[PDB]
Design a protein around this ligand. Structure first.
Ligand SMILES: Cn1cc([C@H]2C[C@@H]2C(=O)Nc2cc3cc(C4CCN([C@]5(C)COC[C@@H]5O)CC4)c(Cl)cc3cn2)cn1
Length: 262
């Protein structure tokens, strides 16, 4: 296909609304990723949020075009793929790689939270890598504003991916945005270090979640995780969101500051 001055060659992925494709300009040869959305006030909010974004660990937004019903969203091609494709099932990845990726994910989540934006769907599929293996947070179709004019807005909409969602989304009418994003980062850490998700959903009906609350760390995936990162996970994966660790305090954690290599 050809649109204006681009050639949509490779399918990079697909979401609820539309799909992402590779667009190499027939004139300049610049490689970008285009989100082609067929057909509400949700695309107005997405293009808006994307404009506000300027950070090394957040996907580059270039602009937006149109073709009647079909919308075109311009984004940086993350030429290194996704974090999901770097996690080996039942194993994970070397702990020094996991720590570096977790530092870069915290740098991205701090930035988004500082501009009053919550991603709302942090998981390995949304965490892309560039040429140098720099982590970039992608896909703002569920991103909402949680702070405006220094005033915090509580959330009520349930969204995300069940294995990554915090328990307060399923139990409470309204909840704070930042702890929900912190919880999903801990599930991403658990995935990087054990190549396995701890539970289907964080509910009182789910046995693997009950086991974690009963402190049974002698079970998988926890037994594949060293005591230092596991101590951090005990602070991130706390049910009551008011007792959960904040990002400034994750920055003071022993494993987060532990020198690693090889
Ligand atoms: C030089 N070279 C590069 C390659 C390709 C490997 C490189 C790649 O895939 N890059 C890439 C991929 C991108 C994917 C997305 C989307 C994220 C979100 N998912 C989901 C909706 C979430 O969960 C389920 C769905 O996977 C859809 C896709 C976006 Cl927004 C931007 C992207 C930019 N760049 C080959 N040669």
């Amino acid at each position: 296909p050809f649109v204006e001055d681009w050639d949509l060659v490779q399918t990079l992925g697909e979401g609820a609304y539309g799909e992402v494709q590779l667009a190499v300009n027939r004139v300049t040869e610049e490689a970008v990723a285009v989100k082609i959305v067929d057909m509400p006030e949700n695309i107005k909010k997405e293009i808006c949020i994307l404009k506000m974004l300027n950070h090394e660990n957040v996907i580059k937004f270039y602009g937006h075009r149109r073709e009647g019903n079909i919308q075109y969203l311009f984004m940086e091609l993350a030429s290194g793929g996704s974090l999901f494709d770097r996690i080996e099932p039942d194993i994970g990845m070397p702990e020094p790689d996991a720590q570096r990726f977790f530092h870069q994910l915290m740098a991205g989540v701090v930035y988004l939270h500082g501009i009053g934006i919550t991603h709302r769907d942090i998981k390995p599929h949304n965490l892309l890598l560039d040429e140098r293996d720099n982590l970039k947070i992608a896909d703002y179709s569920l991103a909402t504003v949680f702070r405006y004019n220094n005033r915090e807005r509580l959330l009520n909409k349930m969204c995300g991916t069940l294995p990554y969602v915090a328990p307060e989304l399923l139990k409470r009418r309204e909840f704070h945005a930042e702890p929900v994003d912190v919880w999903s980062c801990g599930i991403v850490l658990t995935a990087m270090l054990a190549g396995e998700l701890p539970w289907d959903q964080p509910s009182d009906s789910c046995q693997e979640y009950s086991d974690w609350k009963e402190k049974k760390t002698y079970l998988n995936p926890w037994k594949k995780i060293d005591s230092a990162p596991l101590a951090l996970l005990h602070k991130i994966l706390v049910e009551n969101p008011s007792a959960r660790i904040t990002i400034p305090d994750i920055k003071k954690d022993r494993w987060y500051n532990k020198p690693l290599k090889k």
